[PDB]
Every structure is written in C-alpha cells, then in structure tokens.
Amino acid sequence: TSFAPTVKICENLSQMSFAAREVILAAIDARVDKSVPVVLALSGGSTPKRLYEELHEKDLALLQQHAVQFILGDERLLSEDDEQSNFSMATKALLRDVPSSDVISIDRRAALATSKDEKGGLDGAWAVAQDYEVKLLNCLPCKQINGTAKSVPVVDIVLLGFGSDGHTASIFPDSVAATDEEHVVSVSFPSPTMSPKVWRVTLSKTVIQYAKHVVVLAAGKDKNWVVRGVLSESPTDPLPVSRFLRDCRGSVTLLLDPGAGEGVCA
C-alpha cells in the first residue's frame, strides 16, 4: 500500500511495445553523464520480440553509440544458436546490429550436457549462474546489500513478462530462484505447465527489487489471476510467485492486454 504501480491496459501489442519503448528512451535521455550506459535486462517470448524489432528500426544510432548495456534477465540453458534461447530471439530482433561490447553474454557450456535432465541439470545450472554472476558483478554498477558482505548490480530497467503459472523471469513456483535471497543469479526448472523443459538461470528477486524501473508486458486472460494476485493490497489466493514485485524499490509499470488487465481499471 506504499506500492503504486503504473498500470496501462493496451488495446494491441503495438501500444504495449510503444509504451515500453518510451520508458527506455526516456531513461536514456534523462542521463546526466552520457558516458555511462543505461543497463537494460531483456525478457524472452513473442511479447518483447516486437519491442526489440521496433528499437532496431527506430533507435540503432543510439544503441551503436553505446547508450545501453544489455543483459539477459533469464535464459534457457540451450546453445545460443538454438532458436528456443532468449539470446537467439533477441539477436534476430535487435542484437545482431548492436556492438558486441554492449551486450553481456552467458556461457552455457557447463550446462548443455545435462540441462534437459530435470533432476541432474541442477549442478551445471549453478555452474553457469555462478559464472554469469561474476560477469555482472564485474561489468555493471553495483551496490552493497545491507547487512551482508555481498553486492548487487543496479539495473536501470528490467523488462519482464508473466507466465500463466504466476512466474516472472525464470523464477518459477517451487524452484530455488523462488526463495533465493542469497545470489545475484539463481537457477530453476520450469513449472509443470511451462516450456521448454530445460534448466534456467535467472536474475534473482533481489536484483529485480533493486532495479530502478521494472516494466512487465503481459497479454492473455490466462494471466489475469497473476495480475490480480500481484495488485491486491492484501494477499489474495491463488497467490502468484511474482507478488514479490510488490517489494520492488524502483518503479513498476504493468503493460497489459485487455484480457490480462480485466477488472483492474475503472
């Protein structure tokens, strides 16, 4: 009830992708030291594919001038050529024309041999998450987590989606990421209804909750219970794992289609 998200029910995906682009563009414009990039964490799926197409068409010049530093918010532990990886999706849509120096990459090889084994991929998943954590703590601006000897990267904008299972990023119900307040990058295996059935690495709840701006893009009736569960002032059931966004310290914007947004607005 000190949590005041911006909520915009969008008529079509184009309105959704445009609203998202304006947050990005405004953060880039608002910088005082233009020598430092806006850190942007990317999401996967058809939802953001379009936003990324729109930035490629409209804003490459800024991107080629290093205005932004790109990270993957979550990833499938699949080869990076594999079409089911978020890096592939994002590379086709936009990153193919962004300086490689502006994108932080995730090395998945420790995982590829075991990442589709639900039980056995755990160790390899941690191995990739640990590597990626080190890269983010080296390359991004960081702050100390109060009460610890540990630090967290401050992401300017985190882009997210909702799953019909209540998840965001790869923080799934009943996974380690769902209760991990230790790490910067955690791991998970998808929930029963979610695909692809491969191990994941994800930014933790902590990282998301210290981001300056969190923008969720969600469409579909099947997400409306997630939207409601997140937005209700007091806990309501079914309660979705992404209610943790309530404790974000930055701004939160939910960009919803009329199905996902049903009942929310007057």
Classify 144 as helix, strand or coil.
strand
Q: What is the resolution of this structure in A?
A: 2.3
Give exposure, 193-209, as e/b (b: 16+ Cβ within 10 Å). Answer: ebeeebbbbbbbbbbbb
Cα dihedral 20, 129, 154, 176, rounded to 10, equals 80
Does a cis peptide bond (omega within 30 degrees of 0) precede residue 173? Answer: no
Extract the tokens encoding 93.
Answer: 């849509």
H-run or E-run covering 23: helix 13-29
Domains of the chain: 1-266 (3.40.50.1360)
Handedness of CA 87, 88, 89, 90 (dihedral sign): positive
Q: Would residue 220 be called left, alpha or beta, if left means φ above 0 and alpha means ψ between -120 and 50 degrees? A: left
Extract the tokens encoding 214.
Answer: 């969190």
231: amino acid identity, one letter: L
Classify 31 as helix, strand or coil.
coil
Under a CB-based contact definition with an 8 Å cutoff, are residues 48 and 158 in contact? Answer: no
Classify 230 as helix, strand or coil.
helix
